[PDB]
């Protein structure tokens, strides 16, 4: 949506029905940035798949903060179903997750 900047004519209220302000109420959600191998990324990033189905379970052992994955059998059999989620930082600073949404030019 190409638009002229620094508009003090308040045209954005009429041409955009959605508020321009950033939504912040989901910032308190906790996210895990997970890096995948090539096969796991291929089966976890294809748009012909991932219809909301469950993919596995995450075992978080509390003895030494050891996190392991127990994947479901719905994906394959030749790949492993147990994985070790290694952590290099228990606290990650200055890093967030945000989304983009197109605005409504109508009304």
């Amino acid at each position: 949506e190409v638009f002229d900047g620094n508009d003090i004519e308040n045209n954005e209220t009429k041409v955009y029905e959605e508020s321009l302000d950033l939504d912040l109420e989901r910032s308190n959600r906790q996210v895990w940035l997970v890096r995948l191998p090539m096969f796991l990324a291929e089966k976890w990033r294809d748009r012909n798949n991932l219809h909301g189905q469950e993919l596995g379970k995450i075992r978080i052992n509390k003895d030494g903060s050891k996190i392991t994955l127990l994947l479901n059998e719905n994906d394959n059999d030749s790949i492993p179903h147990e994985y070790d989620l290694e952590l290099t930082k228990k606290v990650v600073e200055n890093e967030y997750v945000f989304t983009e949404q197109n605005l409504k030019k109508y009304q």
Partner: protein, 158 residues
Amino acid sequence: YIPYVKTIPKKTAIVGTVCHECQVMPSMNDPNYHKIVEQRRNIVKLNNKERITTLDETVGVTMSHTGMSMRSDNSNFLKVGREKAKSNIKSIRMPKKEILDYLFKLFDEYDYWSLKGLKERTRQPEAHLKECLDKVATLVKKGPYAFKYTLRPEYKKL
């Protein structure tokens, strides 16, 4: 301040915070880990590019299509020469009063006309149209509407 910064507005929303740099390692004790190792060895083994194709037929059969040949081109690609030469203009000497009335009508519609637009509007031979033009009108030489025929000031009042 300048009230123009070329801002593209898009709806944006924070959808969470990350606190753990997670990475997935395959388990060593899994029986299927060796399948992953063999898969990576097959990845570093396979080739993305194939070899060239060698024409194993007789060389003259291949050369028959080349250059100095019987086989004229049957493709229609970029044949602008044949498709722009099929439009032919044929016109006759329509009587003088009708064509000058037509010229006056077009001059009343718009005062400034070139040779090509007037010819495609009236469908007349170039010599007769030129005679009917310079009998009753003239073309601009040094004005902003140069090389366009306009009506004489004597006939401009009507």
